[PDB]
Amino acid sequence: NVTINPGPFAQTGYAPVNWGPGEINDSTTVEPLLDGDIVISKTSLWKEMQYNRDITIRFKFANTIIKSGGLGYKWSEISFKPANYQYTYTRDGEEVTAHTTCSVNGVNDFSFNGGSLPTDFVVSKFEVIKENSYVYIDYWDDSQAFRNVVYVRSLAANLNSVMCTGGSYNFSLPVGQWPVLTGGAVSLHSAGVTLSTQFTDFVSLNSLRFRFRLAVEEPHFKLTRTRLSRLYGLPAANPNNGKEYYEIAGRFSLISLVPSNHDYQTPIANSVTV
Amino acid sequence: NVTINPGPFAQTGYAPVNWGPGEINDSTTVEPLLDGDIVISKTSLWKEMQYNRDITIRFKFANTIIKSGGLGYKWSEISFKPANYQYTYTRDGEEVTAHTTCSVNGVNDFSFNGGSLPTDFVVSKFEVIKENSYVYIDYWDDSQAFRNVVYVRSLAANLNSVMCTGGSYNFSLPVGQWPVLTGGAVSLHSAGVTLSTQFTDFVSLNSLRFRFRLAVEEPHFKLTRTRLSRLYGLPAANPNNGKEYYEIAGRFSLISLVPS
């Protein structure tokens, strides 16, 4: 049995990974209960390569609503929460699957106090994103390019701007007229990308994070039947406004390392016969 | 036997970095107005190596408090806030300088409402952390190891635990009795470490983030002159309790790909 001997340079390489989502900004709520040197491997080969591909991103917001105890006139919380989405699109080469996960940070928190009766209407917190705040849309894919995002030297994304608009939400009061929250738009402009790896005991779970800056644009948002009026932003009541997905489309270039299929180490005479 | 690559090899290398802090969970407040393919570089030569060294993490929390206009009985927030620390220590006959940043996530917020009269005490949000929360501590150093953390394969850390207890905050009411918040303590055990890089335009900016998991302990914490029930956790009023620094000790092993 001939034995093919191993060559001088080591065959070290990438480490097992599972692509997934990143961390999130979260916060619960508690309501009251009453009302009133060593070397581990030898040398190895690696080359720097460029991967420039188109990226299509589809995202969707999500919202959570929590009403307090009592007669039911007043709400405790109306806020944002992460949302996920998946789809298939077509690079000029092939069809590719995609997942995404939206989230926010630096959010502003507004409140309104109609009165101190059981009947009166109060909302203790409704959120709104604005200039200072940001939006992070994480991403992972099945194509070949995403298999070599580990060990990245540089990464830059050219992306288009998008506009998100506010829908409308109706406060179902037991008795009397129904006030309503309506409108509010913010526009996303791209900012830098962020990569991240969490070293748990046996898998390097990893993720990207496309940051996105915000600017404020008309229409305004308003709460009807109240004194709060004509303020800018995107309330959390109905951000999607009846659309299944908002989209961003553009290019991304990465410069990374790659295991070198150097082509020299080969069993001599590896060829067709002659 | 097998063929061998013999030509002169090229020089790819690490990319410029600046070590710093990561992102942070933040949220402002608005108060009412009234009151009522191509190869870029050629084949190169790399190697895999161990860097295993000790570590002393020193940190300290920080709180924010804000009142609401009016008679002065209504607070609107007693919350947490990231904090920084700069220190020096010795490790195997070497003085290392270091910077550390402490933030907290997963907060559980509370509330009290003594009534609606202008005079009644009210605190709309005082936040604690109680087994559903994590404290994330970020650390950077001046040693050689941290220079080669770029392109890491596996990092692990065996670190000792540290108990953090609360102090006391004596709320100031214009007239009458002063109530006070007192108590609480948690134990910070270790969990997975995180490494995160930000490819901004100028230069990459990276961040390490040790992540710790809390577990509640005694003593219990309480708010005087009310009905709040001897709850458990660490109140954000005076978290460091007159101590300049909390500290943790340990060892960390990383396995990194360094240029040869």
Epitope: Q50, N52, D54, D92, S154, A156, N158, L159, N160, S161, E247, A249, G250, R251, S253, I255 | I38, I40, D201, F202
Partner: antibody, heavy 116, light 106 residues
């Protein structure tokens, strides 16, 4: 403010090379990217190539294998080279900046080329 | 690749008269269109960046609209400065591609 200026021969012979130098000003090449376009007499405009903020480059498929775009960040000047040109390659050439995906924001004066 | 067309190539428009122009695309471009203006002896300029967006400093009379495939560009009053060629760009795909170039006449 920002200014983009070109510089080139103007007259050339077939079966030869070609070199053009866009000299930027008022904006770093480490904060933006640059595009090359041209307009053969009459007809319309095309895209030729693009050089990114980091160093990577992208080309047009039809002219691929003939174009070569590169720059020197400290020299604040991009340079393109085209070889083995023909009579059809005659056109006015314009270097331009990019803001979003492929939006062109500021343009140069534009040099005209004659081949014969 | 992406492919675009313009309805006319030269259009007789009187001064102080409303004018509109259309350019069509082959595939589906949701809202990514731009409009450039080239005067004689001048380098092109960017006036539209989206389906109906207005770049800073562009005059008010100019505006745009359209969604899906069909897209249009409209002026309310022609003026002497407005005699020039106008191109429509697409930017929802890898090769940016312009139209043929349709212009005006007085």
């Amino acid at each position: 403010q920002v200014q983009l200026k070109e510089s080139g021969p103007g007259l050339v012979a077939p079966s030869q090379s070609l070199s053009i130098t866009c000299t930027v000003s008022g904006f770093s090449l480490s904060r933006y990217s640059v595009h090359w376009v041209r307009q053969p007499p009459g007809k319309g405009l095309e895209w030729l190539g693009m050089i990114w903020n980091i160093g990577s480059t992208d080309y047009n498929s039809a002219l691929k294998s003939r174009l070569s775009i590169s720059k020197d960040n400290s020299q604040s000047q991009v340079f393109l080279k085209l070889n083995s040109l023909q009579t059809d390659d005659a056109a006015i050439y314009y270097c331009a900046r990019n803001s979003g995906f492929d939006l062109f924001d500021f343009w140069g004066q534009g040099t005209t080329l004659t081949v014969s | 690749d992406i492919v675009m067309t313009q309805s006319h190539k030269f259009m007789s428009t009187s001064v102080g008269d409303r004018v509109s122009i259309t350019c069509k695309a082959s595939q589906d471009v949701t809202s990514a269109v731009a409009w450039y203006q080239q005067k004689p002896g001048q380098s092109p300029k960017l006036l539209i960046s989206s389906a109906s967006y207005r770049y800073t400093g562009v005059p008010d009379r100019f505006s745009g609209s359209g969604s899906g495939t069909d897209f249009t560009f409209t002026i309310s009053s022609v003026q002497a400065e407005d005699l020039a060629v106008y191109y429509c760009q697409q930017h929802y795909s890898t090769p940016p591609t312009f139209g043929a170039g349709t212009k005006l006449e007085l």
